[PDB]
């Protein structure tokens, strides 16, 4: 089998990507946010606290014949930027792109954190890093793709992320007219959860590259690309007025400016992720102040390849026993 899903920013600055999931009998379709930085398909629902619930399509799972609660299971999770979700579980049929998986675990919200609440775009998280970070207790859960695994044609998944546009989710094929040139693979770590691989350097704008070792994860659900200090700060020297602001909660730049690209390698290949890719836009509403879209990783832990450095290229999740992530050019 295999399946294929359009993905769409959720606003003009894609800060995040939205892709209808069809779950239940008759389907209730959602549009969720694929995070291949956590492993936890939770969506809002008919459970959900009422007071947190503000334009978001809910998942009822009393409407659909195929639901069936998973007695006892609960779920908590807690993301990066600080926001959270919990609640009870079900199991349902779940379908993507036209691939479906029979007894997914469907997360039911009954408490969302207010960043959710906000976000009337988002009715929910389909998670795509290792089962070993699903929530669920006491009997942790499969993800769609681990799910999905054996029916697939190949045991992958890609991400086409696009720049202020629509990109594309493939489940168990490779779409050779996606890309140009050849796909660079690298060797991927388990040892966390998460797809966490190795950068072999990078370059700023038109300078020399830089060979040295950035170890890394491959996070569809962050926006922003996470780097150590030294190198972030690297690229923001090139910036004329740029500076890290504490006020803000990292490097802004004048809105004057033109950004330089930003180059990190894979193995022997190289990925350009073009200046305009990291402009965030004001700050505020009518500012002057633009936030930038490579920021430190200093005091997160773990360096972050979110979207604004994917969306730069064709993303290979290869889900084989030995798993391994490729990226070209496009
Ligand atoms: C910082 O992003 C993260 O940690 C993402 N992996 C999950 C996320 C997506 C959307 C909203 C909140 C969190």
Do not use: M
Not at 28 to 48: A, I, M
Not at 139 to 163: E, M
Not at 191 to 220: C, L, M, P, R
């Amino acid at each position: 089998s295999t399946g294929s899903a359009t993905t769409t920013p959720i606003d003009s600055l894609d800060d995040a990507y939205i892709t209808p999931v069809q779950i239940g009998t008759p389907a209730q379709t959602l549009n969720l946010d694929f995070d291949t930085g956590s492993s936890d398909l939770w969506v809002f629902s008919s459970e959900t606290t009422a007071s947190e619930v503000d334009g978001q399509t809910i998942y009822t799972p009393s409407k659909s014949t195929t639901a069936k609660l998973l007695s006892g299971a609960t779920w908590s999770i807690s993301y990066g930027d600080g926001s959270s979700s919990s609640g009870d579980v079900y199991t349902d049929t779940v379908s993507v792109g036209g691939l479906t998986v029979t007894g997914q675990a469907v997360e039911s919200a009954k408490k969302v954190s207010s960043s959710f609440t906000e976000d009337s775009t988002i009715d929910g998280l389909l998670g795509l890093a290792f089962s070993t970070l699903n929530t669920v207790s006491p009997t942790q859960q499969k993800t769609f793709f681990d799910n999905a695994k054996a029916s697939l044609d190949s045991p992958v998944f890609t991400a086409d992320l696009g720049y202020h546009a629509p990109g594309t989710y493939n489940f168990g094929f490779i779409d050779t007219t996606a890309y140009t040139g050849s796909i660079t693979y690298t060797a991927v770590s388990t040892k966390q959860g998460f797809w966490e691989w190795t950068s072999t350097g990078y370059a700023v704008g038109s300078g020399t590259f830089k060979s040295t070792s950035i170890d890394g994860i491959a996070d569809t659900g962050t926006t922003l690309l996470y780097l150590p200090a030294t190198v972030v700060s690297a690229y923001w020297a090139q910036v004329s007025g740029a500076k890290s602001s504490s006020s803000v909660g990292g490097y802004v730049f004048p809105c004057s400016a033109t950004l330089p690209s930003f180059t990190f390698g894979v193995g022997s290949a190289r990925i350009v992720i073009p200046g305009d890719y990291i402009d965030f836009g004001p700050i505020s509403t009518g500012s002057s102040s633009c936030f930038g879209g490579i920021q430190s990783s200093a005091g997160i832990g773990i360096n972050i390849f979110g979207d604004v450095a994917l969306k730069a290229a064709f993303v290979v999740f290869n889900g084989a026993t030995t798993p391994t992530l490729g990226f070209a050019s496009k």
